[PDB]
Amino acid sequence: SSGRIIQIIGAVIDVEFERTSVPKIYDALQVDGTETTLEVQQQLGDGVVRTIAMGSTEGLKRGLTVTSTNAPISVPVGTATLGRIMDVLGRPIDEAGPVATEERLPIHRQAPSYAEQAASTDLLETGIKVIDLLCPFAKGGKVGLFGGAGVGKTVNMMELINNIAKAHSGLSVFAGVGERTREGNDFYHEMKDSNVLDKVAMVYGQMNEPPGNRLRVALTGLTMAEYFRDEKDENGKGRDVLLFVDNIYRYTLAGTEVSALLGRMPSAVGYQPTLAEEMGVLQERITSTKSGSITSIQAVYVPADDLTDPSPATTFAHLDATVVLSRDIASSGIYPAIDPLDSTSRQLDPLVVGQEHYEIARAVQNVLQRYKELKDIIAILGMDELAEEDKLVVYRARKIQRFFSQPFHVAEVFTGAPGKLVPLKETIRGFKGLLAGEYDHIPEQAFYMVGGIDEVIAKAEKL
Amino acid sequence: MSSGRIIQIIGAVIDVEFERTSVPKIYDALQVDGTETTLEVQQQLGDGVVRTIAMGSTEGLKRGLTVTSTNAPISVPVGTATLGRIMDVLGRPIDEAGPVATEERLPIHRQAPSYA
Amino acid sequence: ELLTLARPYAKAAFAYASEQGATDNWSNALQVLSAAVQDEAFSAYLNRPELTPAEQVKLFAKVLGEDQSQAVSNFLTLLADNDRLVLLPEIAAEYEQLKSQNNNNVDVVIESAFPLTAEQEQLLKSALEKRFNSTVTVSVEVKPELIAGVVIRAGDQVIDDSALNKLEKMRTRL
Amino acid sequence: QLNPSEISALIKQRIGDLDTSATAKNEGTIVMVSDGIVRIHGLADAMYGEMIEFDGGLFGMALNLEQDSVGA
Numbered sequence: 052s053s054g055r056i057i058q059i060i061g062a063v064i065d066v067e068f069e070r071t072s073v074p075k076i077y078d079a080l081q082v083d084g085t086e087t088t089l090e091v092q093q094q095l096g097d098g099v100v101r102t103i104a105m106g107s108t109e110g111l112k113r114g115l116t117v118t119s120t121n122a123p124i125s126v127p128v129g130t131a132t133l134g135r136i137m138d139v140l141g142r143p144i145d146e147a148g149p150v151a152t153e154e155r156l157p158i159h160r161q162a163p164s165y166a167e168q169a170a171s172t173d174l175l176e177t178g179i180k181v182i183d184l185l186c187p188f189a190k191g192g193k194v195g196l197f198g199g200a201g202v203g204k205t206v207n208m209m210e211l212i213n214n215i216a217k218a219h220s221g222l223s224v225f226a227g228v229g230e231r232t233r234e235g236n237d238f239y240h241e242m243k244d245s246n247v248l249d250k251v252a253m254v255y256g257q258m259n260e261p262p263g264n265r266l267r268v269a270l271t272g273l274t275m276a277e278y279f280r281d282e283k284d285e286n287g288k289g290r291d292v293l294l295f296v297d298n299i300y301r302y303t304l305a306g307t308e309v310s311a312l313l314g315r316m317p318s319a320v321g322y323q324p325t326l327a328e329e330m331g332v333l334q335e336r337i338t339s340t341k342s343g344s345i346t347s348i349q350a351v352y353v354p355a356d357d358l359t360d361p362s363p364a365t366t367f368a369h370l371d372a373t374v375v376l377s378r379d380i381a382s383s384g385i386y387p388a389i390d391p392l393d394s395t396s397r398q399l400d401p402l403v404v405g406q407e408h409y410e411i412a413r414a415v416q417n418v419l420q421r422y423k424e425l426k427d428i429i430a431i432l433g434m435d436e437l438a439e440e441d442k443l444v445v446y447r448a449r450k451i452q453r454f455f456s457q458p459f460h461v462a463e464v465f466t467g468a469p470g471k472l473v474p475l476k477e478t479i480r481g482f483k484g485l486l487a488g489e490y491d492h493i494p495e496q497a498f499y500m501v502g503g504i505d506e507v508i509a510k511a512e513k514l
Numbered sequence: 515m516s517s518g519r520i521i522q523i524i525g526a527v528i529d530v531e532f533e534r535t536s537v538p539k540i541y542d543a544l545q546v547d548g549t550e551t552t553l554e555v556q557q558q559l560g561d562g563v564v565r566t567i568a569m570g571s572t573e574g575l576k577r578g579l580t581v582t583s584t585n586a587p588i589s590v591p592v593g594t595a596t597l598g599r600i601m602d603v604l605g606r607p608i609d610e611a612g613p614v615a616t617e618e619r620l621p622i623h624r625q626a627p628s629y630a
Numbered sequence: 631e632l633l634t635l636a637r638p639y640a641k642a643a644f645a646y647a648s649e650q651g652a653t654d655n656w657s658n659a660l661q662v663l664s665a666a667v668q669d670e671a672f673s674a675y676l677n678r679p680e681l682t683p684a685e686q687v688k689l690f691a692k693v694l695g696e697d698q699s700q701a702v703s704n705f706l707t708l709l710a711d712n713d714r715l716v717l718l719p720e721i722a723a724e725y726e727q728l729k730s731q732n733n734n735n736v737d738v739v740i741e742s743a744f745p746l747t748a749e750q751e752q753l754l755k756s757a758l759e760k761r762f763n764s765t766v767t768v769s770v771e772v773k774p775e776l777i778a779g780v781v782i783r784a785g786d787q788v789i790d791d792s793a794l795n796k797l798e799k800m801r802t803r804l
Numbered sequence: 805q806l807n808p809s810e811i812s813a814l815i816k817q818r819i820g821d822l823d824t825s826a827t828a829k830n831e832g833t834i835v836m837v838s839d840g841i842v843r844i845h846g847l848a849d850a851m852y853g854e855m856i857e858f859d860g861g862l863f864g865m866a867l868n869l870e871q872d873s874v875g876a
């Protein structure tokens with residue numbers, strides 16, 4: 052049969068059905084007079100369910116009849132979604148017409164079992180000096196870009212897309228979760244200005260929408276990616292799939308906004324008691340299985356520049372390589388603002404990257420750590436109280452900090468200098484020399500915003 | 515009728531129940547019959563109940579005590595007769611020099627001057 | 631939650647009725663009041679914000695007609711002051727359960743796959759008397775969903791011999 | 805006899821003023837007032853976030869549409 056609305060508190064409607072025809076936990080309901088779509092969350096009993104709204108709740112009465120669909124949210128999948136912009140419910144919003152596919156898949160699904168867990172370590176060279184040297188990526192592993200507000204997560208993500216996706220032979224999915232609409236338009240027109248629009252599928256539930264949209268939006272984005280992964284063409288192999296998510300933190304934030312309305316006691320700070328579980332259920336579907344591989348890049352917001360906050364502190368355990376941006380480094384003019392002492396990766400061990408690379412990375416981190424420890428004495432006392440080795444370490448550490456700066460291909464709008472793409476061998480050779488002391492006679496201003504080590508010498512000679 | 519009775523006392527917070535037609539406005543000042551004690555209305559809890567803050571000590575007050583209303587906020591004496599005197603919040607002389615000689619009163623809760 | 635809040639009112643009502651020897655009158659009055667408060671229009675006219683508790687009690691007296699007394703009026707007045715009028719049906723259910731328990735009478739429901747005749751019902755009634763009650767109030771219910779067998783429900787106790795055998799065997803198979 | 809009992813109730817209580825003429829779906833009655841927030845009773849057709857006008861010419865914004873009361 053059909054039910055009727057009895058409460059409307061913000062984004063949390065609740066409906067009363069007959070005692071026999073109550074819907075399941077994640078069924079989808081449709082308000083008769085309007086286009087609002089409801090998703091059941093709880094089942095309060097006595098023929099009452101408590102749902103959330105996939106749209107604006109302005110102008111909804113009490114007593115409007117509601118009909119059920121007896122099925123979860125279903126989105127289209129396949130090749131017909133390539134080069135299309137889609138919303139939460141998988142309806143085209145680029146005004147190119149309806150999608151030409153018939154396939155459907157529910158957006159709520161269990162994670163792959165432990166038996167089907169294929170983990171590989173095949174290096175991936177991104178052409179960024181600090182990323183390659185300190186926290187290498189692995190084809191098929193999950194990456195995260197932690198950082199505050201305005202330290203350059205999005206620019207780094209758009210750089211990694213440029214260095215990989217353009218040369219990538221395989222599909223992709225970009226899922227914006229609560230971000231600037233301007234950025235989505237810019238990305239769409241950038242892909243369409245190039246000819247790689249036929250290799251991406253885009254899902255945009257953005258920052259101007261009710262929490263219902265921002266909540267169940269990443270699920271559609273990776274529902275498409277799951278189908279792209281688990282697909283086989285006859286006389287063909289599985290297709291490598293990229294997956295880019297923007298501010299997965301907004302996914303939990305949109306769950307916090309509707310927490311109290313669902314009738315739950317608040318957790319430690321203000322978060323819902325089910326933070327860890329509702330993050331794990333999402334994060335466990337992104338892995339790569341025996342058939343197909345999903346390379347994932349995720350920007351993760353950090354509230355109030357606090358890496359201890361429950362959500363960023365809960366996200367760390369779900370990633371292979373963690374790149375942590377710092378506001379101090381960005382305010383110091385160094386771009387990218389990647390913190391060399393917090394960036395880690397499971398791929399940085401001698402048996403994967405080789406002995407030489409591992410030794411260079413560890414030596415660089417040791418030098419930076421000792422400089423960080425000396426930074427307090429040289430403030431109260433002078434630079435001249437230290438021994439000669441400590442002064443040499445301070446100079447080398449400042450040069451190292453400068454040398455991690457690099458002009459990106461996509462950042463030339465802000466500054467103007469053309470971008471550079473540094474191979475791994477050049478980075479290793481430059482840092483080996485810089486640690487050996489060969490470049491003690493180069494002023495530290497020559498290591499700033501340059502590519503390989505040859506540009507440093509050229510700039511020093513020009514000075 | 516304006517008269518009502520006390521139904522609850524918790525420290526300095528006193529509840530009063532009026533009949534459902536005569537609930538007084540917020541910030542009205544109530545006088546307790548038989549004593550000297552002024553209550554200020556803070557919020558209306560519905561069903562004729564009103565929650566008030568007492569201006570003074572509440573000891574010796576018991577439930578079921580009749581309370582009368584003034585239909586206006588706390589009023590204080592103003593004019594040139596107030597010069598050189600000491601007054602409490604309710605506008606009464608505490609300098610032990612006789613009653614205030616003026617007749618003009620004003621409510622202490624009024625709107626701030628407008629933009630114009 | 632609702633059942634929890636109805637314990638003292640139901641117990642007091644039953645104690646008073648038993649001590650006054652008028653349990654039947656209270657049972658009828660409570661059923662009538664539960665049906666009245668269950669109604670939508672009457673409840674809407676009852677929860678009007680202008681009504682004092684005396685008005686609600688008088689309205690209940692008018693709708694109840696006869697069978698009213700000072701006892702029921704006082705009970706309704708006490709309920710109205712604490713605003714517990716909405717939970718009358720739970721009070722009625724608790725009162726009926728207590729009255730049945732005091733009379734050593736338990737209710738049973740026999741659900742089968744075919745309609746039953748008199749002799750089977752009498753045989754089952756005699757069999758259930760080994761639970762040592764005064765009487766069983768057998769309410770038979772046909773279910774074509776079942777295939778064969780009878781399931782009897784007495785309070786929270788159920789006895790099953792029907793197609794649930796199939797599910798029990800299925801679980802053991804897998 | 806339960807439904808006949810309901811009909812008997814409908815007979816004894818005649819119509820109940822037609823429930824005060826359906827209580828005029830677009831009507832209400834202030835119940836609670838506190839710190840600039842009020843609760844209204846009986847706005848059956850109150851749509852979420854609409855302007856409610858009181859008796860003095862003021863206006864309000866409906867925030868909560870609960871089962872029996874409307875916050876503002």
Ligand SMILES: Nc1ncnc2c1ncn2[C@@H]1O[C@H](COP(=O)(O)OP(=O)(O)O)[C@@H](O)[C@H]1O
Pocket residue numbers: 200201202203204205206207386387459462465
């Ligand atoms: N690689 C870079 N080099 C120099 N300046 C940068 C770089 N990336 C970003 N900036 C600047 O720093 C800010 C980065 O913000 P943006 O990448 O757009 O998103 P987010 O708010 O997630 O940090 C922008 O003002 C950008 O111009």
Ligand SMILES: [Mg+2]
Pocket residue numbers: 200201204205
């Ligand atoms: Mg940002």
